[PDB]
Amino acid sequence: PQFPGASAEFIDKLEFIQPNVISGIPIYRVMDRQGQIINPSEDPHLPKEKVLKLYKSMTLLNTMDRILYESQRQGRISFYMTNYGEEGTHVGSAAALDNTDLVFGQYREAGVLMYRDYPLELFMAQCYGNISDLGKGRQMPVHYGCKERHFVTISSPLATQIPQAVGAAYAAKRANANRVVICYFGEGAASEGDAHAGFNFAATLECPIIFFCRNNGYAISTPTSEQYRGDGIAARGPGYGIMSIRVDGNDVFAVYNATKEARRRAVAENQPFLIEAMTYRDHPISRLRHYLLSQGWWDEEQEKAWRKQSRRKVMEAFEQAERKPKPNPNLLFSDVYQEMPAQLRKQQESLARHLQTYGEHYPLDHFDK
Amino acid sequence: PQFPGASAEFIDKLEFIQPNVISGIPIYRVMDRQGQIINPSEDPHLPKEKVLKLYKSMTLLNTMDRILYESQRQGRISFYMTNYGEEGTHVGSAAALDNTDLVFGQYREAGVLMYRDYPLELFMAQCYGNISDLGKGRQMPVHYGCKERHFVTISSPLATQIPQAVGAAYAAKRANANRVVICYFGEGAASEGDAHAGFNFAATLECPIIFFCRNNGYAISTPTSEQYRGDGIAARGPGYGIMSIRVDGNDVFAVYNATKEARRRAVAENQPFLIEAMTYRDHPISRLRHYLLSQGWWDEEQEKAWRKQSRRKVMEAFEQAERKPKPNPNLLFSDVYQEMPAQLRKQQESLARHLQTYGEHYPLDHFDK
Amino acid sequence: EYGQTQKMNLFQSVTSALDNSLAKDPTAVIFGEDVAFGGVFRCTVGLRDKYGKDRVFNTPLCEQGIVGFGIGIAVTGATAIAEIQFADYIFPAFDQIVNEAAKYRYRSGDLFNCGSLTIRSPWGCVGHGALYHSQSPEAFFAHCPGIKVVIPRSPFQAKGLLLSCIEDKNPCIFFEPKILYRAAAEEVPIEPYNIPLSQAEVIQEGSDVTLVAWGTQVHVIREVASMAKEKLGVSCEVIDLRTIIPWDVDTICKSVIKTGRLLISHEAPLTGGFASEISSTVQEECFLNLEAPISRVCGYDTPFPHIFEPFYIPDKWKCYDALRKMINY
Amino acid sequence: EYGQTQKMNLFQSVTSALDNSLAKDPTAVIFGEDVAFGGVFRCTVGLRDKYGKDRVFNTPLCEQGIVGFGIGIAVTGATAIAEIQFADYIFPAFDQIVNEAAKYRYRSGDLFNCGSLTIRSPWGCVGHGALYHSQSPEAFFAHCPGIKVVIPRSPFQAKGLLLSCIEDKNPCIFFEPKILYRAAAEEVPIEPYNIPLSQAEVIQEGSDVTLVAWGTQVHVIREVASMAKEKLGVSCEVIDLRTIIPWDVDTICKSVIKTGRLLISHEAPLTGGFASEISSTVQEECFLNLEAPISRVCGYDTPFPHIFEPFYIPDKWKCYDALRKMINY
Ligand SMILES: Cc1ncc(C[n+]2csc(CCOP(=O)(O)OP(=O)(O)O)c2C)c(N)n1
Ligand SMILES: Cc1ncc(C[n+]2csc(CCOP(=O)(O)OP(=O)(O)O)c2C)c(N)n1
Ligand SMILES: [Cl-]
Ligand SMILES: [Cl-]
Ligand SMILES: [K+]
Ligand SMILES: [K+]
Ligand SMILES: [K+]
Ligand SMILES: [K+]
Ligand SMILES: [Mn+2]
Ligand SMILES: [Mn+2]
């Protein structure tokens, strides 16, 4: 054949290509449910200090989740999304990145910030919309962002960050300084048109990007049987020319290994990689705790002491976040554009005049002045 | 593994899945470039009358293309898109459909209408926007549609018809009357978000639809190397759980066989099929002419006579289309909604008043009154 | 008036409209994200069990797909009732709504249409929805000939307007004010009834000023009327616009000819908001009757904030203050 | 004034702006459908050869992708100049423009932004473009705080406004009137220069009536002014708005305070068109000066037709007739 669109032989018999969904792309695992290394050649032999950091980051996230989830049930904060089941995918992948690699994500990625030492005060400040929030209290809770830790502010519309992350990776390639971009999304979000845009652009424009899909079998009430009919998200990658792998998201070491290798090759080759990590909507924290015990790197006393210390640190941040004022109401008008248009300043002045007269009817009490 | 998102074994070694692009999905062919059947078990043994209809439909389309392309060069019509290289994909696939199967397409699908006996007068009427146009002269040329022949009016935005065709197929499934939908698009249009929407919805909602992608290696100036990096469009189908095949679009019999089988199985099974037909931006008409000659079903005299007859029929329709008036200018206001809102009628009355006073400045001359 | 009623909140009234539709129209189907288990705001509870999984079903998470798919169902003549989970997430479908659905009938010379499509979607602020749970996108759609945009103010209004949208032979967007879903109930007829599209409702007659709004904001202006009567002795005519396009120009102009003053209010931002269309039209038709400039009391020209919501919304005090100034002009 | 000039048509002026940008800003890249060979309207001819395939390159055929990708480039601080091949095909990107680009800076508290994004796209009618080659989508974007929307009337204006958009620290949509691409040339400085955003231009002073338009429609109103002077002895002040948002309220209001009459014209449909925003604002600020109702002479509320275009557009006779009536009010 001489067709520019594809490289292929002729065939003289009619045969449809059948998807292999029953025995799909296999699930990479490094340690079993008892925390035992299955294949010694795959063990990353991470040092004790690093592995303890993985463990303490996951558990501290879980401690914070418990407390803020209760806070939401009481109406103290307006909204919350937990990280349960996703602690391993996020802490294991973050540990495989360079500190300056740029992260795009959505609602399940707080562990990446936790691994990057994002202060508990600032997670709290965003959920309370208080004066310490660098986001100025403008977005709903858990819409985190940090310029200093290269974690692009989350937005609620699903999958919009996917083609954006590809553009930032293209820009990085041109800047030539050995940086990758990672982009997280769920298997529901992968149904969006913007996923097809980002996967294809990353391949044709040769971008150093890791796409990290978390597949937990559900998008709200929708099981994956109603979400797609191919072999999950990993089987889509090769159709776009993207190197792809599936991993056990309850295994921090399998997540770490795949992310480390994808990062190495993405940067060297300027080509995208897709990791689909399977999780549940057999927990990553339990599995890693079993591993620590086998190495002699943890025990019940240390576990007790860290449970106590971590609860104390979260409660200290929590109480302080609740007692801080909210930002000045003037801040509802800045940053719409970089400058403030004169007509927008006129609207700001109109609010200031309004509050002078009718202020008793507004909660001016816990807003900064 | 126990993950709801995929059915797969564990693997204990890190291995990325590599796309096979160098030896892609093979290209199904029934007859060679000399019109010879390659594998007798694949020959559809279509009767003489039907095969002559395929040939005469392709050539009549080509005759019309030549004339209307010249008409466009002269500014007699405002725009034209030819069917060169696409005559076989369209006439071969149309012949494999039932007459009532619903067709969605875009700019290369006039052969489907030609095979369905769409009058030359009506192709012309649409390109001239004259009084005979059932589209009332409102769309640019080659934006054909026919309710009587189940060919949904074309629209200029690429790929929008793809998820629509899936919705019409779902509705057909519920109506239970053994009908398929076919949806045509180019390999450029397949990059749109709406392609990812339609392929996925058709699989998860189990719709009796044939997706027919024409891959000619280019979308305007863009070669496929800049369009995608996987193994064309056919390799995408299995990722969505869609049965997929690639065919030689210069071979009407390979197109026909694949379309016939996809239709049979789509209707029986309520499942989508994807056909990617490879074409050039070794011609379908030449190849079929060679076949006719081998059967003793055509010769030079018949070829000459049909060239003459077909030119005469196209020129008769052409001259009549040019001499018809355009529709009444009032028709610019109807069908915006089914009824005309009173405010819209007010705008119609304002135009009528305007033309009463300033009519000398408008081409009222070749518009119906 | 309409047979037996029962108390229903706005989500229950939407379920009642949908139930009535599926019962009387065998073609009708309902689909979108998470509709099968009853929806994230409970609007489809019980409908799958009652009518079947082929008629009430979940789609993949893809708004451009949801609208495209709905248009295709409607092209065959079947009634297609699509859900978009929040109006904030309608934008991925903007091309399918504006370039396709709105233009389908016109561009085909009426050979094809998608008149049997309705797109329903939660709308408007909710106290803490911030940028993407709060939006009021009706002015974006108002500039698109060929669609209708309809917004109810209460459970009774919602069921009659939604049944009208489902039955109307044109693609309709029906925006459900989400802050009302579990607000107060009212009596709603159990059997089907219709409220006409493109028809405003004068809910209180008045002589000094006309107030226009839609959705939850109707209740704000109703309270503003009460404040103006008590504090200023000013008589307000309160109008619910109900249909954004095609809108009821005549009812609004008749009111303003009588009162000589108009205040329009909406949650959506001022600039390019639908108040600008009403104001410009009323000025054109009622110029010589205008005692004062037409006032627009709208959201600010910012995205919709989280912590600042109480300061952002065009509340009763903002409306009242503007009204006081207009009365004094 | 601005150094050496040469005659340029509007497409050539766009190439000049782009060339100047790439020469002085090493971060800048240009991308979209078919831009590498020079573009379907020749606006990028020669730029790939001059600046490199990594800087002027084709994307896949996916508008939502083009805008998303551009936003990501801009998040890193690099200048991203995206093309959308016709403004009619901007709608697939509406969610990325409205929910993402416009809100990027606000929602992050200025931790991130995409200020270095410009989206350029051919715009406006062209004689035979029908529904999908003709559209003027500016009113859809006008209702979105956080983007700027800019439309030039000529080659000189296009290069200075486009350079301003590329350099402005906010995401900009620049609409190029395609019917002007190969229309008359004028002298255009070869070196970079800027024309300010959010600034209207009074191109002819007048005393009796203010006329406002943008794009090709500026030329229509310029001719209307000439017709009104000759046929009616009426003196028209002709204003090119240039930036749709944020718009220059002050220049328009100053003019209307002087003249007491305003006629606004645009190709886009009347209902929800940007004339409604200008009219409502001017009415609010210039109420006591208004001698006559503000007139809007716009496209009809239909999709944009093929064969009927001569009857659809708000041409000089439609504008003149409206003006005659307003002068006589
Ligand atoms: C465009 C858009 N549509 C719908 C939603 C509503 N929504 C918020 S989360 C969610 C499910 C997402 O599922 P998935 O991507 O699988 O992530 P998971 O919640 O399982 O981690 C939905 C539909 C949204 N935020 N954006
Ligand atoms: C949404 C949208 N974007 C861009 C265009 C402009 N356009 C008209 S045809 C075309 C190329 C289409 O290529 P392909 O789908 O491969 O079909 P082919 O022309 O090769 O048959 C483009 C970009 C369009 N019509 N719609
Ligand atoms: Cl959400
Ligand atoms: Cl086109
Ligand atoms: K997002
Ligand atoms: K189309
Ligand atoms: K309807
Ligand atoms: K900019
Ligand atoms: Mn999920
Ligand atoms: Mn092509």
In this structure, how many other beta carbons lie within 10 angstroms of the beta carbon of residue D261?
A: 24
Q: Which two tokens stand for residue C227?
A: 């404040």
> Could you confirm whether C133 is annotated as catalytic?
yes
**Three-state DSSP state, D105:** helix
Element (H, E) at C232: helix C217-232
Number of structural domains found in chain C: 2
Distance D298 CA to ligand 3 centre (A): 39
* A156 among annotated binding-site residues: yes
* Ligand 2 pocket, residue B188 CB under 6 Å: yes
Look up the CATH architecture of domain A1-369.
3-Layer(aba) Sandwich (3.40)
Q: By the 8 A CB rule, do D65 and B228 touch?
A: no
Report which residue type is found at C317: W
Residue-level length of chain A: 369
Q: Which two tokens stand for residue D119?
A: 């989206």
DSSP code string of D212-250: EE-TTHHHHHHHHHHHHHHHH---EEEEE--EEES--HH
Report yes or no: A157 at the C interface, CB cutoff 8 Å. yes
| β-pair partners for C236 | C209
Nearest atom within ligand 2 for CA of residue D33: 23
Report yes or no: A40 at the B interface, CB cutoff 8 Å. no
Cα–Cα nearest to D240, from D264, D258, D224:
D264
Q: By the 8 A CB rule, do C21 and C163 touch?
A: yes
Nearest atom within ligand 1 for CA of residue A215: 16
Cβ distance C111 to B134 less than 8 Å, yes or no, reads yes
| C-alpha dist (Å) from residue D93 to A220, A233, C64, D99 | 26, 24, 11, 10
Distance between CA atoms of residues C211 and C201, nearest Å: 12
Distance between CA atoms of residues A233 and A273, nearest Å: 12
**Three-state DSSP state, D46:** coil
DSSP-derived pairing of the beta strands D80-83 and D117-123: parallel
Q: Which two tokens stand for residue A233?
A: 């998200």
Residues D122 and D12 in one domain: yes
Cα A319 to its chain centre, rounded Å, is 26
| β-pair partners for D189 | D5
Cα–Cα nearest to C148, from C245, C275, C213, C248:
C245
Cβ distance A229 to B16 less than 8 Å, yes or no, reads no
At residue A51's C-alpha, the angle toward residues A49 and A56, to 5°, is 90
Distance B189 CA to ligand 6 centre (A): 9
Q: Which of D54, D68, D110 is closest, CB to CB, to A335?
A: D110
Q: By the 8 A CB rule, do C33 and C62 touch?
A: no
| β-pair partners for A11 | B28
Distance between CA atoms of residues D147 and D135, nearest Å: 19
Please give the radius of gyration of chain C, using alpha carbons only, rounded to the nearest integer: 20
Domain termination residue (choose one: D165, D200, D235): D200
Residues C221 and C133 in one domain: no
Report which residue type is found at C136: S
Q: By the 8 A CB rule, do D90 and D121 touch?
A: yes
Residues C174 and C308 in one domain: no
At residue A248's C-alpha, the angle toward residues A242 and A252, to 5°, is 105
Cα–Cα nearest to A149, from A172, A108, A182:
A182
Phi, psi (rounded to 5 degrees) for A88: -75, -45
Distance between CA atoms of residues B338 and C74, nearest Å: 14
Q: By the 8 A CB rule, do B135 and B143 touch?
A: yes
Q: By the 8 A CB rule, do C277 and C265 touch?
A: no
Residue D206 gets the label, from left (phi > 0), alpha (psi -120 to 50) or beta, of beta
Q: Which of B166, B175, B336 is closest, CB to CB, to C69?
A: B166
Cβ distance D131 to B79 less than 8 Å, yes or no, reads no
Burial class (CB in 10 A: 0-12, 13-18, 19+), D128: middle
Residues D54 and D192 in one domain: yes
**Three-state DSSP state, C33:** coil
- Domain of C248, CATH number, reads 3.40.50.920
Choose, from C1, C33, C128, C133, the residue flagged as catalytic: C133
Question: Is the CA virtual torsion C233, C234, C235, C237 positive or negative?
Answer: negative
At residue C145's C-alpha, the angle toward residues D66 and C202, to 5°, is 125
Cα–Cα nearest to C146, from D157, A43, B340:
B340
What residues have CB less than 8 Å from B300, skipping those under 6 apart?
A: none
Q: By the 8 A CB rule, do C308 and C248 touch?
A: no
Cβ distance B137 to D305 less than 8 Å, yes or no, reads yes
Domain termination residue (choose one: C200, C218, C250): C200
Selected residue of D62, D121, D295 to mutate for chain B interface (largest B Cβ count, 10 A): D62
Residues C110 and C133 in one domain: yes
Cα B248 to its chain centre, rounded Å, is 16
Please give the radius of gyration of chain A, using alpha carbons only, rounded to the nearest integer: 23
Distance between CA atoms of residues B177 and B351, nearest Å: 47
Distance between CA atoms of residues D58 and D53, nearest Å: 9
Distance between CA atoms of residues C162 and C79, nearest Å: 13
Longest C-alpha distance within chain C, in Å? 60
Residues D182 and D60 in one domain: yes
Residues D275 and D315 in one domain: yes
Q: Which two tokens stand for residue B92?
A: 């071969």
DSSP code string of C153-221: SSHHHHHHHHHHHHHSSS-EEEEEEGGGTTS--EEEESS-----SS--EEEE--SSEEEEE-TTHHHHH
**Is the previous residue joined to B4 through a cis bond, with omega within 30 degrees of 0?**
no
Q: Which two tokens stand for residue A252?
A: 């921090």
Cα–Cα nearest to B180, from B99, B236, B252:
B99
Distance between CA atoms of residues B250 and B255, nearest Å: 8
Contacts of A153 in chain D (CB under 8 A): 107-108, 111-112
| C-alpha dist (Å) from residue C297 to B273, C273, D100 | 54, 11, 26
In this structure, how many other beta carbons lie within 10 angstroms of the beta carbon of residue B356?
A: 8
Resolution for the entry shown, Å:
1.6
Considering every ligand atom, which ligand is closest to the CA of A90? Answer: 1
Cα–Cα nearest to B192, from C64, C198, D31:
C64
Phi, psi (rounded to 5 degrees) for D233: 60, 25
Residues D253 and D110 in one domain: no
Distance between CA atoms of residues A145 and A148, nearest Å: 9
| C-alpha dist (Å) from residue B272 to A18, A187, A239, B200, B261 | 12, 22, 18, 10, 12
Cβ distance B27 to A42 less than 8 Å, yes or no, reads no
What residues have CB less than 8 Å from D163, skipping those under 6 apart?
A: D17, D20, D21, D192, D193, D194, D195
| C-alpha dist (Å) from residue C24 to A277, C19, C77, C83 | 46, 9, 15, 20
Cα–Cα nearest to A285, from A18, A65, A69:
A65
Angle subtended by helix axes C274-286 and D274-286, to nearest 10 = 60
Q: By the 8 A CB rule, do D298 and D275 touch?
A: yes
In b/e form, how buried is each residue of B100-120, taking b as 16+ CB within 10 angstroms? ebbbbbbbbbbbbbbbbebeb
Cα–Cα nearest to C117, from C30, C50, C16, C44:
C30
Distance between CA atoms of residues B323 and D147, nearest Å: 49
For chain C, counts of helices (H) and of strands (E): 12, 14
Residue-level length of chain B: 369
Cα C123 to its chain centre, rounded Å, is 8
User: What string of H, E and C letters represents the secondary structure of chain A?
Assistant: CCCCCCCCCEECCCCCECCCCCCCCCEECCECCCCCECCHHHCCCCCHHHHHHHHHHHHHHHHHHHHHHHHHHCCCCCCCCCCCCCHHHHHHHHHCCCCCCEEECCCCCHHHHHHCCCCHHHHHHHHHCCCCCCCCCCCCCCCCCECCCCECCCCCCCCCHHHHHHHHHHHHHHHCCCCCEEEEEECCHHHCHHHHHHHHHHHHCCCCEEEEEEECCEECCEEHHHCCCCCCCHHHHHHHCCEEEEEECCCHHHHHHHHHHHHHHHHHHCCCEEEEEECCCCCHHHHHHHHHHHHCCCCHHHHHHHHHHHHHHHHHHHHHHHHCCECCHHHHCCCCCCCCCHHHHHHHHHHHHHHHHHHHHCCHHHECC
Report yes or no: B270 at the C interface, CB cutoff 8 Å. no
Cα–Cα nearest to A80, from A363, A323, A318, A334:
A318
| Contacting partners of chain B (3+ CB pairs under 8 A) | A, C, D
Burial class (CB in 10 A: 0-12, 13-18, 19+), B340: middle
Q: Token match 């009459």: residue? A: D261
Element (H, E) at D297: strand D295-299
Q: By the 8 A CB rule, do A211 and A242 touch?
A: yes
Nearest atom within ligand 2 for CA of residue B214: 21
What residues have CB less than 8 Å from B302, skipping those under 6 apart?
A: none
Cα–Cα nearest to C239, from C268, C215, C265, C210:
C210
Q: By the 8 A CB rule, do B231 and A6 touch?
A: yes
Chain A: closest CA distance from residue B210 (Å)? 13
The full set of domain ranges for chain A reads: 1-369
Distance between CA atoms of residues D66 and A203, nearest Å: 14
Q: Token match 């360079």: residue? A: A98
* A358 among annotated binding-site residues: no
Residues D229 and D193 in one domain: no
Report which residue type is found at A203: A
Question: Is the CA virtual torsion C295, C298, C300, C302 positive or negative?
Answer: negative
Distance between CA atoms of residues A275 and A213, nearest Å: 6
**Is the previous residue joined to C246 through a cis bond, with omega within 30 degrees of 0?**
yes
Cα–Cα nearest to C92, from C116, C121, C72:
C121
**Three-state DSSP state, C117:** strand
Cα–Cα nearest to D203, from D226, D170, D179:
D226
Phi, psi (rounded to 5 degrees) for D106: -60, -50
In this structure, the residue with its CA closest to atom 21 of ligand 2 is B186
Q: Which of B3, B228, B237 is closest, CB to CB, to A203?
A: B228
Residues D186 and D244 in one domain: no
Distance between CA atoms of residues B310 and D43, nearest Å: 42
CA atoms within 13 A of residue C19's CA, in its CB half-sphere: 17
Residues C195 and C205 in one domain: no
Q: By the 8 A CB rule, do D149 and D215 touch?
A: no
What residues have CB less than 8 Å from A248, skipping those under 6 apart?
A: A27, A28, A29, A30, A254, A255, A277, A278, B1, B10
Nearest atom within ligand 1 for CA of residue C85: 4
| β-pair partners for C117 | C80
In this structure, the residue with its CA closest to atom 19 of ligand 2 is B219
In b/e form, how buried is each residue of D147-161, taking b as 16+ CB within 10 angstroms? bbbbbbbbbbbbbbb
Please give the radius of gyration of chain B, using alpha carbons only, rounded to the nearest integer: 23
Cα–Cα nearest to C253, from D267, B346, D211, D278:
B346
Cβ distance A200 to B5 less than 8 Å, yes or no, reads no
Q: Which two tokens stand for residue C79?
A: 């009634």
Nearest atom within ligand 1 for CA of residue A185: 15
Distance between CA atoms of residues D211 and D322, nearest Å: 11
Please give the radius of gyration of chain D, using alpha carbons only, rounded to the nearest integer: 20
Cβ distance C283 to D279 less than 8 Å, yes or no, reads yes
Distance between CA atoms of residues B113 and B94, nearest Å: 8
Cβ distance C284 to D293 less than 8 Å, yes or no, reads yes
Indicate the Cα dihedral angle C301, C304, C305, C310, nearest 10°.
90
Cα–Cα nearest to A240, from A216, A209, A274:
A274
Q: By the 8 A CB rule, do A7 and B224 touch?
A: no
Report yes or no: A300 at the B interface, CB cutoff 8 Å. no
In this structure, how many other beta carbons lie within 10 angstroms of the beta carbon of residue C185?
A: 15
Contacts of D281 in chain C (CB under 8 A): 276
Element (H, E) at D29: strand D29-32
Q: By the 8 A CB rule, do B275 and B210 touch?
A: yes
Distance A189 CA to ligand 1 centre (A): 6
Report yes or no: A268 at the B interface, CB cutoff 8 Å. no
* Ligand 2 pocket, residue D59 CB under 6 Å: no
| C-alpha dist (Å) from residue A91 to A86, A213, C134 | 9, 14, 33
**Three-state DSSP state, C65:** helix
Domain termination residue (choose one: C200, C228, C244): C200
Distance between CA atoms of residues D198 and A103, nearest Å: 35
At residue D154's C-alpha, the angle toward residues D148 and D155, to 5°, is 100
Q: Which of B189, B326, B355 is closest, CB to CB, to D307?
A: B326
User: Annotated binding site of C for K(+), which residues?
Assistant: 115, 117-118, 165, 168, 170
At residue C189's C-alpha, the angle toward residues C183 and C191, to 5°, is 130
| C-alpha dist (Å) from residue A79 to A107, A366, C128 | 12, 20, 9
| Contacting partners of chain A (3+ CB pairs under 8 A) | B, C, D
User: What string of H, E and C letters represents the secondary structure of chain B?
Assistant: CCCCCCCCCEECCCCCECCCCCCCCCEECCECCCCCECCHHHCCCCCHHHHHHHHHHHHHHHHHHHHHHHHHHCCCCCCCCCCCCCHHHHHHHHHCCCCCCEEECCCCCHHHHHHCCCCHHHHHHHHHCCCCCCCCCCCCCCCCCECCCCECCCCCCCCCHHHHHHHHHHHHHHHCCCCCEEEEEECCHHHCHHHHHHHHHHHHCCCCEEEEEEECCEECCEEHHHCCCCCCCHHHHHHHCCEEEEEECCCHHHHHHHHHHHHHHHHHHCCCEEEEEECCCCCHHHHHHHHHHHHCCCCHHHHHHHHHHHHHHHHHHHHHHHHCCECCHHHHCCCCCCCCCHHHHHHHHHHHHHHHHHHHHCCHHHECC
Domain range for residue D232?
A: 201-325
In b/e form, how buried is each residue of A213-229, taking b as 16+ CB within 10 angstroms? bbbbbbbeebebebbbb
Positions of D marked active-site: 63, 133
Residues C155 and C278 in one domain: no
Element (H, E) at D31: strand D29-32
Distance B217 CA to ligand 10 centre (A): 6
In this structure, the residues whose C-beta lies within 6 A of any atom of ligand 1 are A 108, 156-158, 186-189, 214, 216, 218-220; C 33, 61, 63, 85, 89
At residue C259's C-alpha, the angle toward residues C254 and C265, to 5°, is 85
